[PDB]
Design a binder for this molecule. Sequence first.
Ligand SMILES: COc1cccc(CC(=O)Nc2cccc(Cl)c2)c1
Length: 186
Amino acid sequence: SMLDDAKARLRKYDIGGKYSHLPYNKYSVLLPLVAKEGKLHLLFTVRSEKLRRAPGEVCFPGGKRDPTDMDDAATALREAQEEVGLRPHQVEVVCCLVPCLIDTDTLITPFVGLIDHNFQAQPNPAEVKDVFLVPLAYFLHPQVHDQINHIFEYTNPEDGVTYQIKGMTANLAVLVAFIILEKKPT
Ligand SMILES: COc1cccc(CC(=O)Nc2cccc(Cl)c2)c1
């Protein structure tokens, strides 16, 4: 099946807890995969304009580890619940992808999660201005704009709204698309 095939592919790239104890400032993100209309999608957030760090930017759910978290995956799930109402029974964490080093002292660990079909986002407006889906296949043939760094522009066909996706968030989306969609019979 589509979902069993995606999980099998993802597991081959799992690094597990290999880098998890290193003494960094630690953040986790959840890369949430949603199946709709017979295709996989990634779920993104738009950060609230009142946040001091990166207002109005497209981001995956996530945040800083705190002492309650049993592990890095728990960070991702706790933050996703706070931001978009995703409950733990609604997500299966499949793997941990290569972590992202930034600022010399920070390590961001991405987890891919399969999201239940009955989940409906409840954006928490103190943190999230918007939530939207992009088909995973978009990231194989994105609409690129050069600002010099590459920015993706995705237009939702439901409503015509265009979102800019860039940086680590864009990078991770392409990685997941490659992992799941490369070398597939039609
Ligand atoms: C983009 O690079 C990142 C670096 C460190 C963490 C994160 C995840 C995050 O913080 N997401 C998030 C989304 C919506 C609202 C709020 Cl409060 C947080 C992303």
